[PDB]
Amino acid sequence: QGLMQFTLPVRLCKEIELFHFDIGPFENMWPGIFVYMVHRSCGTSCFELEKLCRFIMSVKKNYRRVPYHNWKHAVTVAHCMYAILQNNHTLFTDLERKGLLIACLCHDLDHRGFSNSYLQKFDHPLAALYSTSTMEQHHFSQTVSILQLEGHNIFSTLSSSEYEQVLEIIRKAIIATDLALYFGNRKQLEEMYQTGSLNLNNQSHRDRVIGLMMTACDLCSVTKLWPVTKLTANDIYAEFWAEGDEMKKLGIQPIPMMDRDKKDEVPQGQLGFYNAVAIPCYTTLTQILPPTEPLLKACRDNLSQWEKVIRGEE
């Protein structure tokens, strides 16, 4: 380094600050987009450039060539966290800023394009090692594996204490991307917000709020402009339909969301998802962190586009 400031072309320099930024189809630019975000979010001092670059490149290598849960999803989820962090400057600790972009880049490490349910029904060894949040315990394990490679300890300057804290932020942040855990977490956050007991000084409360940020970042395809949201849905369903086919091979009728013979039902399925998951998620997140409101707004725009799909207006 250390007078070596990463810079993006003008359109990307400006649009990367917005919630609805799409990182584009140039895979070789995604590392530099991430380093740019870390440097602006955390500092040019938070990591050794050489270590960070070696970390990024091994993380990339440990994402698979699957239609949705790939390297592009990793960096997209990290970008949504960057936009939240940058819009809420003063609310987050030095360790939080360090851990959370890394947790986002690593949150689906070594994903095979299959749900926790499918692993359990297949009887995958990972389902015997990790009885709940199966893939999420695996993603965290792969994150620690990569951090333990020679020349890959991006946290090397931290004390023993701070290193355990940062790895505990990452572990909780990654486990929270289990959507099965989201529903309870958001209910509690909503009760706490409304009875005015929510306290960002209570670590157990910060944990919940970081969990909800992680869901919000993970679901951020619903917060893009319609043509991005619509095209991303295709990749999401390409994975679901493969899992459906694999369910059928075990002699199990999949749920309709995963059945490629039931493609006509996707628009109504999207409606349910925006109503039951996405809108509540961004609504509670906006109550706790008002500057995240553009995510709710974009989500509501996309619900309205799915309503139009159903009404054959598109």
Ligand X SMILES: CCc1nc2ccccc2nc1N1CCN(S(=O)(=O)c2ccc(C)cc2)CC1
Consult the annotation and say whether 73 binds a ligand.
Answer: yes
Consult the annotation and say whether 107 binds a ligand.
Answer: yes
- Distance in Å, CB of 217 to Zn ion, minimum: 8
Nearer to ligand X, 117 or 283 (CB): 117
Angle between helices 160-175 and 94-106 (to 10 degrees): 50
Residue recorded with tokens 């880049």: 105
Interaction of residue 279 with ligand X, rule CB under 6 A: no
Task: At 24, give phi and psi (nearest 5°).
Answer: 85, 170
Near ligand X by CB under 6 A: residue from 58, 87, 88, 117 = 117
Chain residues that interact with Zn ion, rule: CB under 5 A: 108, 218
Consult the annotation and say whether 261 binds a ligand.
Answer: no
Interaction of residue 273 with ligand X, rule CB under 6 A: yes
CA distance 61 to 64: 8
Catalytic pick among 39, 69, 138, 139? 69
Instruction: Choose from Zn ion, ligand X, Mg ion, none: what does 257 bind? Cβ within 5-8 Å by kind.
Output: ligand X
139 part of the active site: no
Near ligand X by CB under 6 A: residue from 32, 67, 269, 291 = 269
Consult the annotation and say whether 20 binds a ligand.
Answer: no
- Distance in Å, CB of 273 to Zn ion, minimum: 15
Angle between helices 203-218 and 94-106 (to 10 degrees): 40
Interaction of residue 108 with Mg ion, rule CB under 5 A: yes
Task: At 134, give phi and psi (nearest 5°).
Answer: -55, -55
List the interface residues with Mg ion, window 232-271 (CB under 5 A): none
| Rg of the chain, C-alpha, whole Å | 19
**What is the maximal distance between C-alpha atoms in the chain?**
60
Which amino acid type is present at position 254?
P
Nearest alpha-carbon partner for 281 in 265, 291, 292: 292
Which residues form the catalytic set?
A: 69
Q: Using CB under 6 A as the criterion, which residues of the chain lie in contact with ligand X when the complex forms? A: 115, 117, 179, 219, 221-222, 236, 255, 257, 269, 273
